[PDB]
Design an enzyme around this catalytic site. Structure first.
Site, PDB file in Angstrom:
ATOM      1  N   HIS A  66       5.515   7.837   3.718  1.00  0.00           N
ATOM      2  CA  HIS A  66       4.674   7.599   2.528  1.00  0.00           C
ATOM      3  C   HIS A  66       3.294   8.279   2.585  1.00  0.00           C
ATOM      4  CE1 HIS A  66       7.038   3.799   3.465  1.00  0.00           C
ATOM      5  NE2 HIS A  66       7.640   4.263   2.381  1.00  0.00           N
ATOM      6  N   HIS A  96      -5.434   6.818   5.874  1.00  0.00           N
ATOM      7  CA  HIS A  96      -4.370   7.389   5.025  1.00  0.00           C
ATOM      8  C   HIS A  96      -4.932   8.490   4.100  1.00  0.00           C
ATOM      9  CE1 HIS A  96      -3.062   3.242   6.041  1.00  0.00           C
ATOM     10  NE2 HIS A  96      -1.880   3.818   6.166  1.00  0.00           N
ATOM     11  N   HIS A  98      -3.923  10.262   0.123  1.00  0.00           N
ATOM     12  CA  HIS A  98      -3.100  10.328  -1.078  1.00  0.00           C
ATOM     13  C   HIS A  98      -3.405  11.620  -1.799  1.00  0.00           C
ATOM     14  CE1 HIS A  98      -1.722   6.185  -0.693  1.00  0.00           C
ATOM     15  NE2 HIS A  98      -2.927   5.974  -0.204  1.00  0.00           N
ATOM     16  N   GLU A 108      -5.996   8.428  -6.313  1.00  0.00           N
ATOM     17  CA  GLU A 108      -5.585   7.116  -6.835  1.00  0.00           C
ATOM     18  C   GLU A 108      -6.606   6.576  -7.851  1.00  0.00           C
ATOM     19  OE1 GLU A 108      -4.030   4.799  -3.372  1.00  0.00           O
ATOM     20  OE2 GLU A 108      -2.168   5.476  -4.263  1.00  0.00           O
ATOM     21  N   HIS A 121      -8.264   7.083   2.388  1.00  0.00           N
ATOM     22  CA  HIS A 121      -8.496   5.656   2.567  1.00  0.00           C
ATOM     23  C   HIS A 121      -8.710   5.289   4.023  1.00  0.00           C
ATOM     24  CE1 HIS A 121      -6.267   4.810  -1.463  1.00  0.00           C
ATOM     25  NE2 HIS A 121      -7.501   5.243  -1.637  1.00  0.00           N
ATOM     26  N   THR A 201      -2.714  -0.261  -2.399  1.00  0.00           N
ATOM     27  CA  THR A 201      -2.162   0.661  -3.390  1.00  0.00           C
ATOM     28  C   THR A 201      -0.706   1.041  -3.122  1.00  0.00           C
ATOM     29  OG1 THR A 201      -2.995   2.682  -2.299  1.00  0.00           O
ATOM     30  CG2 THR A 201      -4.409   1.581  -3.994  1.00  0.00           C
ATOM     31  N   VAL A 202      -0.158   0.458  -2.074  1.00  0.00           N
ATOM     32  CA  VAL A 202       1.212   0.655  -1.648  1.00  0.00           C
ATOM     33  C   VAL A 202       1.809  -0.735  -1.437  1.00  0.00           C
ATOM     34  CG1 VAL A 202       0.710   2.818  -0.407  1.00  0.00           C
ATOM     35  CG2 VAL A 202       0.643   0.670   0.914  1.00  0.00           C
TER      36      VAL A 202
HETATM   37  C1  LIG Z   1      -1.742  -2.619   4.845  1.00  0.00           C
HETATM   38  N1  LIG Z   1      -0.464  -2.164   5.429  1.00  0.00           N
HETATM   39  C2  LIG Z   1       0.641  -2.718   4.623  1.00  0.00           C
HETATM   40  C3  LIG Z   1       0.900  -4.072   5.261  1.00  0.00           C
HETATM   41  C4  LIG Z   1      -0.045  -5.087   5.129  1.00  0.00           C
HETATM   42  C5  LIG Z   1       0.184  -6.316   5.735  1.00  0.00           C
HETATM   43  C6  LIG Z   1       1.340  -6.520   6.482  1.00  0.00           C
HETATM   44 CL1  LIG Z   1       1.618  -8.047   7.231  1.00  0.00          CL
HETATM   45  C7  LIG Z   1       2.278  -5.508   6.625  1.00  0.00           C
HETATM   46  C8  LIG Z   1       2.054  -4.276   6.013  1.00  0.00           C
HETATM   47  S1  LIG Z   1      -0.408  -0.529   5.544  1.00  0.00           S
HETATM   48  O1  LIG Z   1      -0.776  -0.064   6.916  1.00  0.00           O
HETATM   49  O2  LIG Z   1       0.976  -0.057   5.203  1.00  0.00           O
HETATM   50  C9  LIG Z   1      -1.528   0.020   4.361  1.00  0.00           C
HETATM   51  C10 LIG Z   1      -2.852  -0.404   4.369  1.00  0.00           C
HETATM   52  C11 LIG Z   1      -3.718   0.035   3.372  1.00  0.00           C
HETATM   53  C12 LIG Z   1      -3.235   0.868   2.369  1.00  0.00           C
HETATM   54  S2  LIG Z   1      -4.238   1.488   1.095  1.00  0.00           S
HETATM   55  N2  LIG Z   1      -3.629   2.989   0.893  1.00  0.00           N
HETATM   56  O3  LIG Z   1      -4.224   0.744  -0.206  1.00  0.00           O
HETATM   57  O4  LIG Z   1      -5.671   1.464   1.512  1.00  0.00           O
HETATM   58  C13 LIG Z   1      -1.913   1.296   2.391  1.00  0.00           C
HETATM   59  C14 LIG Z   1      -1.055   0.852   3.374  1.00  0.00           C
HETATM   60 ZN   LIG Z   2      -4.186   4.306   0.886  1.00  0.00          ZN
END
Ligand SMILES: CN(Cc1ccc(Cl)cc1)S(=O)(=O)c1ccc(S(N)(=O)=O)cc1
Ligand SMILES: [Zn+2]
Length: 262
Positions: A66, A96, A98, A108, A121, A201-202
């Site tokens: 992703h 991350h 995007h 985004e 991010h 955002t994911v």
């Molecule tokens: C936050 N994570 C997703 C996630 C959050 C909590 C749990 Cl328990 C499991 C997975 S992440 O590493 O996949 C992530 C964090 C922040 C963001 S973003 N692109 O909105 O800042 C995307 C993805």
């Molecule tokens: Zn992000």
């Protein structure tokens, strides 16, 4: 084949479909958002950002399918975000990026109808209140994400350490050692920002994020930006597809206000 593990940005599993397995996609604090500057609440009680990033915090860089993830050791308080709209200390966890299919869009967040070529991010969690990233991710005040827009311009040599690695991690689920990363030098000179309450955002799209979006963009060349689209969203052996785009469209404000530091 959209599911609770198999989400993406392709036609069958992209953002329009995420609600099918993550109903909070249609929630009241979803991200990202268009920032209409004329409607921003210029708040004199917002503090300056305080940012401290130890280049030795970074441990590995990974292709999730992703995006690319730079992961940081978050067992100590070497790399932390404080101040701004935040109470207490938020520990650095992950970076991350995007982007979109072409250089004219891909961010985004959108600012007054304008889309940047990409958006970085920087994900942090509230270690003064919560025992872990996992616990923090489900609390309204648990996460803080710093957003930095990338615009097409002169090649950024700060992006080079990351782009130099992208062949190592072409396939979904590849990782490589990645250390001595000077994240703080990647930020723009000014840390003026907007802030609002939102979400990841994911998937799984948790409404746990204090968003801090930097007003000033940093540069990326078109040929640097194209490196990221060569990443695959598919694993080794499986049928190859490129991660040509990985941004979520702006979501409804639903009463929320965006505040500006500046
Ligand atoms: C936050 N994570 C997703 C996630 C959050 C909590 C749990 Cl328990 C499991 C997975 S992440 O590493 O996949 C992530 C964090 C922040 C963001 S973003 N692109 O909105 O800042 C995307 C993805
Ligand atoms: Zn992000």
């Amino acid at each position: 084949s959209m599911s609770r593990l198999s989400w993406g940005y392709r036609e069958h599993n992209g953002p329009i479909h995420w609600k099918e397995f993550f109903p909070i996609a249609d929630g009241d604090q979803q991200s990202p958002i268009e920032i209409k500057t004329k409607e921003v609440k210029y708040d004199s009680s917002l503090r300056p950002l305080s940012i401290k990033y130890d280049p030795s915090s970074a441990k590995i860089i990974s292709n999730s399918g992703h995006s690319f993830n730079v992961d940081f050791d978050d067992t100590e308080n070497k790399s932390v975000l404080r101040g701004g709209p935040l109470t207490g200390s938020y520990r650095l966890r992950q970076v991350h990026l995007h982007w979109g299919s072409a250089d004219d869009h891909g961010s985004e967040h959108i600012v007054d109808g304008v889309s940047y070529a990409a958006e970085l991010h920087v994900v942090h969690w509230n270690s003064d209140k919560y025992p872990s990233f996992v616990e923090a991710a489900h609390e309204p005040d648990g996460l803080a994400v710093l957003g930095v827009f990338l615009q097409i311009g002169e090649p950024n040599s700060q992006l080079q350490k990351i782009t130099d690695t992208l062949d190592s991690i072409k396939e979904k689920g590849k990782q490589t050692r990645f250390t001595n990363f000077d994240l703080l030098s990647l930020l723009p000179p000014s840390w003026d920002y907007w802030t609002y309450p939102g979400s990841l955002t994911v998937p799984p799209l948790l409404e746990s994020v204090t968003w801090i979006v930097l007003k000033q963009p940093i540069n990326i060349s078109s040929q640097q930006l194209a490196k990221f689209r060569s990443l695959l969203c598919t694993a080794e052996g499986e049928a190859a597809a490129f991660l040509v785009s990985n941004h979520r469209p702006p979501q409804p404000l639903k009463g929320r206000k965006v505040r500006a530091s500046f």
